[PDB]
């Protein structure tokens, strides 16, 4: 297919994913496993409530890992922001 169309379809698929029953359930499973604590803060010896579950390898980078618990971490906002910058260095 046309490259820009493939990009469109990937982005539409990713948008739909966050509405999915599978994501809703898996998000909850990760937060529960993590005891609602930010996993980056915990590794840095800090206690912070998580507010988001993030893909380690981003969803748009590897669709196949979208529901893998070892590809998901509960994060606070500050750690999500830090990770976003880190990921720009890796993937643009
Ligand atoms: Zn944190």
Author numbering: 39 to 130
The paper states:
An HNH endonuclease from the thermophilic bacteriophage GVE2, a thermophilic and lytic bacteriophage that infects Geobacillus sp. E263 isolated from a deep-sea hydrothermal field in the east Pacific1920, was the first thermostable member of HNH endonucleases from thermophilic bacteriophages to be biochemically characterized. The overall structure of GVE2 HNHE contains two antiparallel β-sheets and four α-helices, and shares a conserved ββα-metal fold with those of other HNH endonucleases. Sequence analysis shows that residues H93, N109 and H118 in GVE2 HNHE are the key residues in the conserved ββα-metal fold motif, and could be components of the active site of the enzyme. Residues H93, N109 and H118 in GVE2 HNHE are key amino acid residues for DNA nicking.
Note that we solved the crystal structure of the truncated GVE2 HNHE from N39 to G130. The initial 38 residues (M1-R38) could not be solved because of the disordered electron density, indicating the N-terminal region of the protein is very flexible. Like other endonucleases, a zinc ion exists in the center of the structure of GVE2 HNHE and is coordinated by Cys76 (in the short loop linking helix α2 and α3), Cys79 (in the helix α3), Cys114 (in the short loop linking the helix α4 and β2), and Cys117 (in the helix α4 at the end of the C-terminal domain). It resembles the Zn2+-bound structure of Gme HNHE11, suggesting that the Zn-finger domain in HNH endonuclease is conserved. Firstly, GVE2 HNHE possesses an extra α-helix (α3: residues 85–92) at the C-terminus, which is absent in Gme HNHE. However, no additional metal ion was observed in the HNH motif of GVE2 HNHE. Here, we found that GVE2 HNHE and the Zn ion were co-crystalized, supporting the importance of the Zn ion for DNA nicking. There is no significant structural change for the two structures of GVE2 HNHE with Mn2+ and Zn2+, however, the C-terminus of GVE2 HNHE shifts by a distance of approximately 1.3 Å upon binding of Mn2+.
